[model samples]
Target: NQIDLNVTCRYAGVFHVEKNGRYSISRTEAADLCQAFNSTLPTMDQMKLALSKGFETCRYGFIEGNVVIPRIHPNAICAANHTGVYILVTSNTSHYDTYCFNASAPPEEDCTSVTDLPNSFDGPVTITIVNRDGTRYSKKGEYRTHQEDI
Candidate 1:
């Protein structure tokens, strides 16, 4: 399925899959870090979905469990390139980044209502609004207008 607002922003600046350090982090540490940032480690299915979304990186990271998986087989130090693409490894050590998962709730407001408009309005106006889901709505109504400086 196409990634909608339901999916977390896996892109950079939103989820930092890459970090600066010599040694990898522990699973517990990774989970804690993700939680601190309001996210959690990506599950196998989640990672697969992310991969399907064109997530191709050269580094190895931890997933939902203690499993360490890589984006693609690059024939690197972890020579499991020929194995399954997603399950390239079977162990998690202090030598890889953690794939974080963050899925937030949707917005509570529905922008299709007219009563929620501004408190004061006095003129012939056209309202056009676009929702985050990319749906557009337009409404045109007439009202008494006494002011000249609209």
Candidate 2:
């Protein structure tokens, strides 16, 4: 028997995959995934490019618990341009809600351009590369976010 499933953007992401890793979609691969077709293939530099854009509810989503949509996370917007990809990396502090970026929620990865972060953290918290262009990496759970801006 063939198992057919229809995932919705209301829950999982556009490029979200399953355990078998057989969920094929457009632009999931880094090479084919273009930034134009509701798909993403963000590079390390591109990731940095996103962060410098600053935070706004109009563009990205508010990473919280048990909720997400659209799932096309662009790079974090900064007010100004920074030199490189500045992520909030630490292994101690988790659960953030200051600027509306949360790494402990559904989206799991809350990227930012905020540099020189404070040195008080816990657990394995790192805004390294949570959401690529079309994917998000979270521990102990699946991840995705709604697009407030589109």
Candidate 3:
């Protein structure tokens, strides 16, 4: 529920096909495609987030980190080893969709109050603050971009 997913969401860029009707994109192309839309490549965790939120498709895509991600339950077609769901393909592979993320922060709320601050009082200006306490936070013109190593 972070953002609307029912419409105008997910699969912005399906597996790009070449003139021969083959689905494939190089790593450089994937990066460029995502950037063209003011977005970046999605990480593995980002891919899972989409999958867990009821997003599914038979086509596999190229996730960020140069790794392949397939959203499918273990089967002979997608996953031969039956390793549950999701598959990671190595780099230098071809014929995969580029999962681009052009996600935006949720609409900002109407500020109920505002206070003026001293011009020179620069002692942190407040009490303890949690930068990333495993929760969503907000600020004006600031968007917390999410990504994971895995």
Candidate 4:
């Protein structure tokens, strides 16, 4: 009820991830936010293969155990309008909004931008910002083997 939905990346072949407001998150923070987007959840047969390649949306997400959400057509406002993969047939510590399976990923326009990107594809980790008196501010490493995109 505070407006937040428009981070869509639809690709019927399977791929969905609800925004974070029409329902919060949880269920292990939506599986660590689907491994921070490298992707994870989405296995009830990959949510029935994205509802048999017709992927629908209205709200509700999270998969791999269920909480699924999908709707082919009919818009009384989605979900209850009726269609398929709508199994909330339960919960898992409440808070919904999740769906992310990578099966390989690379679509959605290669999901680039941000100077081509800054995550460096979650490979390694090493960044520092010391100060408590040791006298230091910023330092980083590891992105193609120790930072190099400047």
* RMSD, one per candidate, in order: 17.4, 18.1, 15.7, 15.8
Report the CA-based lDDT of candidate 2 relative to the real structure.
Answer: 0.24
> In model 4, which residue pairs have backbone atoms overlapping below 3 Å?
62-98, 142-146
lDDT for each residue of candidate 4 in 21-136, tens digit (9 for 90 to 100): 45766567566545644567877776666666666677787787778677777678777677877787654558777776765644332322111112223443333322223332
TM-score against truth, every candidate: 0.48, 0.18, 0.47, 0.27
* Top candidate, metric lDDT: 4
Which stretch of 10 consecutive residues in model 1 shows the poorest summed lDDT? 1-10
Query: Each candidate's lDDT (Cα)?
Result: 0.43, 0.24, 0.40, 0.53
Clashes of each: 0, 16, 2, 2
Ranking by lDDT: 4, 1, 3, 2
Model 3: per-residue Cα lDDT over 21-139, one tens digit each = 23545556556545543567776666565555544444455667655444446556654434322565544556455566645422222112212111212222121111112222222
**Per-residue alpha-carbon lDDT of candidate 2 for residues 25-117, written as tens digits (9 for 90 to 100):** 222221221221233333333233233442122111112221111212343353122223234333242322111221222332233222221
Q: Model 1: per-residue lDDT, tens digit, 1-150?
A: 110111123432123343333334455655654564466777666666555554544445667664544344455555345323245445434555656665641222122321222222333455432333445344453222323212
- Candidate 1: global Cα-lDDT? 0.43
